[PDB]
Design a protein around this ligand. Structure first.
Ligand SMILES: [Br-]
Ligand SMILES: [Br-]
Ligand SMILES: [Br-]
Lengths: 393, 53
């Protein structure tokens, strides 16, 4: 055990040195930054601004804290000087707008710091109104903030990490927690003042999982479809218009071990992915739901993080306690490989990011750039990276 | 206060829906081919190459 800890800390040090040696041959962009507090959550906000007179743009990240002691917790918005490194994403013609260099200097400042009650287990901006952010906080309360608390959502009896807005019904929110419950909420920001904290109770509670509910997501094209995954090893599809006492119209024994994440494809309405403690990502056709489409193998430990590319239908990212973020290309499924190439894994494993030296907490695809990801680990390090276009183009 | 480990500028110049039924068959067919080629071999291929050389 002492020897295992010695060996693990040794292995990680060697891996990180080997990674740094190969970064020039793997990425078009790598940015690292030591945060003052570690964050459990990350999400890019939708906005990008080209800064006149500079070689960068300003893009923003939603972060949180988890002090877990007698220190104050905060919801944070960080502002990143994202260097102009891509001819395709920046209008360079006004030559006040310069191209960035490897010698340049770029900063990250905490642009907003809002006191938060408890660990920030997860934070998501409302898609229809990006100034509104929901969090999962102390004891299972969820909180709503207007960044330009406004509400507290009481219903959960244990902390939770599942939280998702409805992209087709503004202010509709779903949450899932370690109390085995999923709560639905109607958050009307009209009510918001600035003085008082409004207390909201759920519009519905689902008692359909028999263990911790780890993740929920609404279908991007159906305002009544909610997907949930749980430590009870099920993926469940709920029709929010139906009687909550009723069973979920479909219960899928998707894995034989805990399922940590669910991700619905933003372009293909029937394509869904689940990430599990069995070290695997499973793909599903919602029309043919009890028979898995494919298994994405490669991670060496539990898979926790999962997010489709916002730009390319066949591209999927996952993260794992094996300290890797992997990017998969579904179009390569079933191809043949040389024996040497197969040593790196399945052909659909397009790219591996191995820059983190601890458990990966969460990652988020940058919506305003080409193949840019922001990712977090336990040791306060934020990384903003982009694989070489030679690999994905 | 940020470390920039690499920057390589992307110069000027360089998206079809997935059919899920086709993906399912390709997954299953590839699995059949990889059990036949790699799993519990009945002889060592390197043995045959050595004898034929
Ligand atoms: Br969301
Ligand atoms: Br299809
Ligand atoms: Br031989």
């Amino acid at each position: 055990e002492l020897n295992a800890e010695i060996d693990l800390q040794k292995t990680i040090q060697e891996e990180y040195k080997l990674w740094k040696q190969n970064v020039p041959f793997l990425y078009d962009l790598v940015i690292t930054h030591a945060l003052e507090w570690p964050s459990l959550t990350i999400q890019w906000l939708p906005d990008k601004k080209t800064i006149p007179g500079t070689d960068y743009s300003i893009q923003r990240l939603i972060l949180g804290t988890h002090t877990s002691g007698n220190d104050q917790n905060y919801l944070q918005i960080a502002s990143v000087q994202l260097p102009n490194f891509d001819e395709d994403t920046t209008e360079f013609t006004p030559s006040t707008i310069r191209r960035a260099q490897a010698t340049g200097s770029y900063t990250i400042e905490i642009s907003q710091k809002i006191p938060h009650d408890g660990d920030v287990n997860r934070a998501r901006y409302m898609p229809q109104k990006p100034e509104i952010i929901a969090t999962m906080g102390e004891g299972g309360n969820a909180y709503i903030f207007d960044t330009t608390p406004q509400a507290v959502l009481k219903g959960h009896t244990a902390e939770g990490f599942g939280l998702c807005w409805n992209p087709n019904l503004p202010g509709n929110l779903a949450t899932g927690a370690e109390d085995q419950v999923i709560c639905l909420w109607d958050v009307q920001t009209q009510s918001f003042t600035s003085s008082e904290t409004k207390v909201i109770s759920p519009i519905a509670k689902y008692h359909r999982h028999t263990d911790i509910v780890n993740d929920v997501q609404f279908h991007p094209q159906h305002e009544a479809l909610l997907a949930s995954v749980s430590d009870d090893c099920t993926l469940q599809i709920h029709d929010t218009r139906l009687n909550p006492e009723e069973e979920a119209p479909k219960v899928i024994q998707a894995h034989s071990k805990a399922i940590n994440a669910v991700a619905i494809n933003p372009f293909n309405d029937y394509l869904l992915a689940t990430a599990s403690a069995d070290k695997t990502v499973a793909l599903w056709d919602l029309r043919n739901p009890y028979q898995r489409l494919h298994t994405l193998e490669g991670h060496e430990d539990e898979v926790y993080g999962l997010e489709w590319s916002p730009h390319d239908e066949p591209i999927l990212a996952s993260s794992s306690t094996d300290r890797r973020v992997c990017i998969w290309d579904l179009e390569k499924i079933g191809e043949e490989q040389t024996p040497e190439d197969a040593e790196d894994g399945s052909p659909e494993l397009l790219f591996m990011h191995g820059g983190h030296t601890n458990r990966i907490s969460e990652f988020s695809w940058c919506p305003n750039e080409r193949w840019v990801v922001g990712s977090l680990a336990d040791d306060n390090i934020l990384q903003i990276w982009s694989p070489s276009r030679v690999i994905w183009g | 206060e940020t470390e920039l480990l690499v920057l390589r500028f992307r110069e000027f110049g360089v998206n079809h829906p997935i059919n899920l039924h086709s993906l399912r068959s390709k997954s299953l067919i590839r699995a059949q081919g990889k059990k036949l080629d790699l799993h519990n071999r009945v002889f060592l291929r390197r043995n045959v190459r050595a004898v034929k050389m």
